[PDB]
Amino acid sequence: MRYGHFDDAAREYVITTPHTPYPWINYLGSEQFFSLLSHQAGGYSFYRDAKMRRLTRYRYNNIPADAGGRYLYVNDGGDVWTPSWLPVKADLDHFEARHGLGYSRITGERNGLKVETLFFVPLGENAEVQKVTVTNTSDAPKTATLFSFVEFCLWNAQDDQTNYQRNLSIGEVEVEQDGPHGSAIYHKTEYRERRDHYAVFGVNTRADGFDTDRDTFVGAYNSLGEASVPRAGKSADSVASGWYPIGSHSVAVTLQPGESRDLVYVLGYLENPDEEKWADDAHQVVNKAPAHALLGRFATSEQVDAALEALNSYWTNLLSTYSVSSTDEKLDRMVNIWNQYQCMVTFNMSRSASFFETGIGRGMGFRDSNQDLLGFVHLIPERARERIIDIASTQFADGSAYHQYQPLTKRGNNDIGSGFNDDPLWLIAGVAAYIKESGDWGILDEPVPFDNEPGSEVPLFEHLTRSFQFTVQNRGPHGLPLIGRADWNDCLNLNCFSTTPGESFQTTENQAGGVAESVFIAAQFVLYGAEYATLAERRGLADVATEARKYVDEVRAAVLEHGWDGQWFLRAYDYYGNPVGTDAKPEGKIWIEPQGFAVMAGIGVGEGPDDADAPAVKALDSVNEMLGTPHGLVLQYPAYTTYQIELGEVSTYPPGYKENGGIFCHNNPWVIIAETVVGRGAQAFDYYKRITPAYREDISDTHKLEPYVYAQMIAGKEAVRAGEAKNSWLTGTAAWNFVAVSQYLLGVRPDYDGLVVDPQIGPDVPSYTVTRVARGATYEITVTNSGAPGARASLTVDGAPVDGRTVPYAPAGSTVRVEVTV
Amino acid sequence: MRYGHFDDAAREYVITTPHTPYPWINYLGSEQFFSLLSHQAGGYSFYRDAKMRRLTRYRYNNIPADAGGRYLYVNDGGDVWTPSWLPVKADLDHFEARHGLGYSRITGERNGLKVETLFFVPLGENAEVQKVTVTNTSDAPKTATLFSFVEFCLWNAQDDQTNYQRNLSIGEVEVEQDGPHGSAIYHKTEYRERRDHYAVFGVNTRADGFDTDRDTFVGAYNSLGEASVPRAGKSADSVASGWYPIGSHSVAVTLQPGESRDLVYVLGYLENPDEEKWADDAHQVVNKAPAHALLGRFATSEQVDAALEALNSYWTNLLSTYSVSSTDEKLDRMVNIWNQYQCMVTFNMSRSASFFETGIGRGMGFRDSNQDLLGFVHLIPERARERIIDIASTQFADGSAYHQYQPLTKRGNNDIGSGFNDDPLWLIAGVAAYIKESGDWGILDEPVPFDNEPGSEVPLFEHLTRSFQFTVQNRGPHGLPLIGRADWNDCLNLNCFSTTPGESFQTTENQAGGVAESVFIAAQFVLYGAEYATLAERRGLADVATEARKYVDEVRAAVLEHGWDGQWFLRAYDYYGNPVGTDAKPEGKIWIEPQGFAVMAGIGVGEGPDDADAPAVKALDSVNEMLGTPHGLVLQYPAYTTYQIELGEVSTYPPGYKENGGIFCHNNPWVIIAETVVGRGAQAFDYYKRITPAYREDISDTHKLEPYVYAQMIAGKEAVRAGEAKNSWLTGTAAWNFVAVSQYLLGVRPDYDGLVVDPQIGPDVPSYTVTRVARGATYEITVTNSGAPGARASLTVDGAPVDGRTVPYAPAGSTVRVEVTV
Ligand SMILES: OC[C@H]1O[C@@H](O)[C@H](O)[C@@H](O)[C@@H]1O
Numbered sequence A, B: 001m002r003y004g005h006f007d008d009a010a011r012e013y014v015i016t017t018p019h020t021p022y023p024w025i026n027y028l029g030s031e032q033f034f035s036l037l038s039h040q041a042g043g044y045s046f047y048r049d050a051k052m053r054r055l056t057r058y059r060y061n062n063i064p065a066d067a068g069g070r071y072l073y074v075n076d077g078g079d080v081w082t083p084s085w086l087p088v089k090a091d092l093d094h095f096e097a098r099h100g101l102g103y104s105r106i107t108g109e110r111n112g113l114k115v116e117t118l119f120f121v122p123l124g125e126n127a128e129v130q131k132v133t134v135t136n137t138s139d140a141p142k143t144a145t146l147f148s149f150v151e152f153c154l155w156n157a158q159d160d161q162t163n164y165q166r167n168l169s170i171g172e173v174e175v176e177q178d179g180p181h182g183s184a185i186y187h188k189t190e191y192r193e194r195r196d197h198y199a200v201f202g203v204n205t206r207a208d209g210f211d212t213d214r215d216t217f218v219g220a221y222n223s224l225g226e227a228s229v230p231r232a233g234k235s236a237d238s239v240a241s242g243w244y245p246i247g248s249h250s251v252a253v254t255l256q257p258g259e260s261r262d263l264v265y266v267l268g269y270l271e272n273p274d275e276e277k278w279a280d281d282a283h284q285v286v287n288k289a290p291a292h293a294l295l296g297r298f299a300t301s302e303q304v305d306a307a308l309e310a311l312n313s314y315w316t317n318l319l320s321t322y323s324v325s326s327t328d329e330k331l332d333r334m335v336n337i338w339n340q341y342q343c344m345v346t347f348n349m350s351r352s353a354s355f356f357e358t359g360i361g362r363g364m365g366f367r368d369s370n371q372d373l374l375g376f377v378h379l380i381p382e383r384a385r386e387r388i389i390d391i392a393s394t395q396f397a398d399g400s401a402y403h404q405y406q407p408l409t410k411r412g413n414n415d416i417g418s419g420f421n422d423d424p425l426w427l428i429a430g431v432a433a434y435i436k437e438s439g440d441w442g443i444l445d446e447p448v449p450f451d452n453e454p455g456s457e458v459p460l461f462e463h464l465t466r467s468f469q470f471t472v473q474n475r476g477p478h479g480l481p482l483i484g485r486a487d488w489n490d491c492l493n494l495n496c497f498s499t500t501p502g503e504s505f506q507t508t509e510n511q512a513g514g515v516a517e518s519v520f521i522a523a524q525f526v527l528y529g530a531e532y533a534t535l536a537e538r539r540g541l542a543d544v545a546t547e548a549r550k551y552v553d554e555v556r557a558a559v560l561e562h563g564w565d566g567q568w569f570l571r572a573y574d575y576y577g578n579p580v581g582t583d584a585k586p587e588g589k590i591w592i593e594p595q596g597f598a599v600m601a602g603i604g605v606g607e608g609p610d611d612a613d614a615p616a617v618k619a620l621d622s623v624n625e626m627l628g629t630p631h632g633l634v635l636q637y638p639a640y641t642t643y644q645i646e647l648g649e650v651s652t653y654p655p656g657y658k659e660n661g662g663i664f665c666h667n668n669p670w671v672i673i674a675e676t677v678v679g680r681g682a683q684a685f686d687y688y689k690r691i692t693p694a695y696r697e698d699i700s701d702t703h704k705l706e707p708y709v710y711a712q713m714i715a716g717k718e719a720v721r722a723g724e725a726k727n728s729w730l731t732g733t734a735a736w737n738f739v740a741v742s743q744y745l746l747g748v749r750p751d752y753d754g755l756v757v758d759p760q761i762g763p764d765v766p767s768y769t770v771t772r773v774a775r776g777a778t779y780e781i782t783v784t785n786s787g788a789p790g791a792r793a794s795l796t797v798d799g800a801p802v803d804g805r806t807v808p809y810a811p812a813g814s815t816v817r818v819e820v821t822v
């Protein structure tokens, strides 16, 4: 069952019904202002920080879901309906929602009146613009009144939802019916005090009426679907004083058959210099200069169209760096559009706000943002550069770091815990990926502070040495890295032993002592420790590099000597020194993380894919057999059926969900990459298809969430809801799958001095061409792939055969034609 | 004007329409299990802690408000309606909601079927019981199917509302259609791990069907008012797996004309010893022993009725300590029932959970629980004693204390601030009130630790000396106590100077240095410092006592010399030594707190009510003129119209609301008491009536909130919403108003060595009789009041005239009859 389809030419997903399995959203904005917009106009907007500067209010777990957003009530001769269907739910003759890149169009038609709304955040603007087109599709004149509606949030989302004892008395607004370009409403709660910002909601026409008080607009005992004002046919011109401020304007229109009318609405975030906050000496009236300027830039449809066109050009440019043309339109669709679009979203949102993440406790994750860089560096390297600096600035002198930082202030916090020992290494991963992509070796010289300490700056490279040394100086009795709070797996807390209900394992105090070690961090250290060594060598630090490689060899040696269970890699050693993830236990016999990451590091790789005796092959074979399901690879097997106190949060989840038997998509690409490493491209591509959006669209009724983006987890084989996803959009799954498909499956990956072309995708993709812009040059890579296992590519460049699979970077401005034969 | 009426004989408030200005609630329970229940069945229940053990989910700021609670969908031939009106909102032939003491009855009738529901929490039980009576009021036999409904909360309310990324995968339940006494549903989320508790929702009959998944019961795209299952007329027998667990049973009923049937539903909280949690070896089935037992205790209507009568006898007994019979039934109503009922609620709830306080951040405030004791000690002295010990156990060795403590752990925390210099003295206030009431001097010897520290125990009296000494050693340049973070007024933050938005003035770090002083703490010290001295004198500490009264003398002198502005007392001195609350400033000229408290402490009192030269009189006259309004006395005048950086949070509220010009009811009783001290009983009684429920019932459309309980704040004179209240139920206004009316207006107040009878209520109550049980004896106080200004009483006890107004305590079991002439 499907509820829409992909429109590749328009780079949009077309949702053809309001009746989807779950609200399907799009993200508007790619700079500092963002909007979560569902196919039913639901959601909210915020500036830089979803917790601290949320413009509008949204209710998670509402009944029904997603009943609240940007609505346009249409009163046609007494009949009231909304084109987004919800909240009124009046029968519509036609409905369609198109989610595009940075914009969405939602159209609803009922009884001869069609209303189309274009939603988007213009480039360079901290605002959400709506271009509404009302068309009389009947054969007779029509007169209707349109009521816009948005519910404001009191900036601090957390305060908004919990501190009514105070905030029900602070709501303040200003009303400007006769502004320079039309009518506008100003939400200025706390502007009288510490806030130098306010929100504006206006329309490019002089409104017939307005409303700023929710209770008056909606009416007592009524839901948004039964709003009194629209039903009455006229605004109540309410002026709020506390309680719930809203933005609403009414506009009556008369249209002859076939005639249409445009209306442009703007929801904007404005700021004023402290000395320019007030229009009056008494400091009672807000200075509207920036608001009047904003409304002026979108006073006409022509201005809107120009901005939309600029946005389209912006995306065409971003997507011009990596593209592919093959015989698989689902693959191409993901690689050329959707996976890259999603990587921009994760780069901006981290794991903070979606229709699952509430935009409160989570900011920008240290681990999360570093990994997102992996799939974002080719898009806008200059912004990836700044992000690296912001991230490394929240790192501590000893190498450890804040697990996340507040988006608004860029300062780290422990709101979701601290002491995650896998964090430090991810910084090296990010910098390495960035340097391979840009060749910007100078970034290593950038002065970077520790915990934003003015005057504590040291070269970025020094930060990497702190990260590297942290792991070296924190290994257990087996020579494996100590796990600490937890490694990549947030629920593997071996230093917890909590018996206190309700207290988060993520933040709860941990027990000192013990010998808990992580096999995953060991693999992570081997993989990224090598990159550090390489970076140190290029920097002229020969001894440091030599030393670094010694440690790397020691750790990998430990994995093979103390991290092997027999047919797969061990997961870790608990607080007691006992093995975790061994066949010796009845549950949690094999964990996926080390299997994929150890092989990615090259640990246990043998003669070839046919070497059934190489550890890597045995491990991946165990992964296939024990963790495989038609929906992807489950985290571990069997899932824990009883609380295992020495393991922490993991066993608290019912079997088959999240970290306990759920398909945690984020780690699937590691197995995909591992498979290409051992030379089994066919299997790697297989795993890729099981979890990729375009391939799962045909089972939308099972996946349930957005069919155009990856989700964090799909219920596993042990779950009653097997195959059903949760936590869509914000997940490292996007960055990692893009790395997997673009760099390992399609095989085009940037290295320090050359571009590697190493296809390993199997026989399902026999021929394809990748256009890759790297270091200012364009590489047209034509591939003829037999897909034979173990078969590696041979190259020919500009007519002449070359040695190996690394094409040294050609000078900027050139076009290199690489002919690849696998 | 009115939406119901008081029913004194039944001790209930009868709401005669579902269309009230705002949801009006009642609190069920008085021990460890509590329920918030609106007149539309909205609300939720929790065990001991509203944040960590919430059984059911409730949405604050929902659209519409209060859409969610204990519903019973009646399907009669396809027509579906709910007796609580919401959420279906079907036209009812009859509707009524009676809120009583620890129970409520909601009745709705539609098309021949009347459904009455009795809600209550039985004594000694951790459960909410519903006794439903369905009656066929037609002349023909009828049939219908009733669907019960309750939405579970995942215990941790904070996590429930924000951590969906995790909790949408942990919801777990168990269904038992064929139990020992009927059908039962079990909500056992996280019982699998650290929780030793689960909830049960059962009915005393074998249900036809059930539902545990919200989405299935309600249906996609539907609100609770459009629930699919009830409309279909058949349960879907859903078994939840994550998402949203609910409790619902379908019961088919058949009734002959005039016939009725009872159904008993139970929502219970159960715990099992760790070693008896499971019924199976595999640990997958919860041990239902305690649940079965509970359900058995409420399997019949007879058991419910017996429990209700025990509850009634319980309240009759509690209300037998202080009673009054006068010519004013509104006064009697408040004194005899409602004010005392509310004091029991505030004692249990503090300021944690109401339809305004969200039951998340606020626990049990030090200052709040000490003041609540003032109006609760006569009800259950043993519990008051226990509360004092728990409270003082969260005090630090230097006198200061945790501003509040978590109800479940009784451990302090800084979640809402710390370092409020008025907190310490409230401990003395609470103990003094308890000693005077009980005569239990032994409590002073009770060993109490500091911050719950093992081995730190010292006698409770020492705790009081630490409080007393903290103020003496923390005075500023004028000899007035330093204010610190703030005094009683949480918004007077003189050491804040915050320019950073979002940051709560309550938690933000204050600046060191400065000489900020509080005139309020000065008056508080003079008042309770004297009480401390008396306690010391009784313990034989002439040394300690003598010095103590000297300090009181010094501070008293300081107030008159440095805290007098000319026509009223100064409020404070800011960080730079600048006066606050002076006529020299344009705004915030006079603040109410010091006026009432200074006079209560006897500061500035002269020759009588007409001594125009007395500071106390000048101050009170100023209060009347500048702060008086028909709805009570505003905190200060005029309100601040611009942000005063050096004053903290106070000026951030728009004029007329909360601490900035609002009527903060809590401090009105201080002026009421002050007026009785000065001898102006008529004016004191006037103020009492302006803010008291029974007197404001006639303007319910203006007060908006519950007409039977005090609220924290009523919009003041400068607010466009003047007269409208917010934050009902949970406020110290209840305890202080009871003190004022019972001890100073009516004049019956316990003293250390006797019961003082000092009426001072004015001419509006010419005669009344108070029945007071004190120290085991019953005092029948017959008062003949002239109400003459300044006129105070002369007493005759048991046919023998006496001198003064203090009747020494008669032996227990006695009945003394005191004739009072005023
Ligand atoms: O933290 C609790 C405090 O919050 C402040 O915002 C309010 O003005 C006070 O009335 C309240 O006591």
Ligand SMILES: OC[C@H]1O[C@@H](O)[C@H](O)[C@@H](O)[C@@H]1O
Binding pocket: A416, A490, A491, A506, A649, A658, A659, B165, B166
């Ligand atoms: O702090 C966020 C973490 O919360 C845990 O409960 C979840 O299992 C993790 O997947 C998540 O990363």
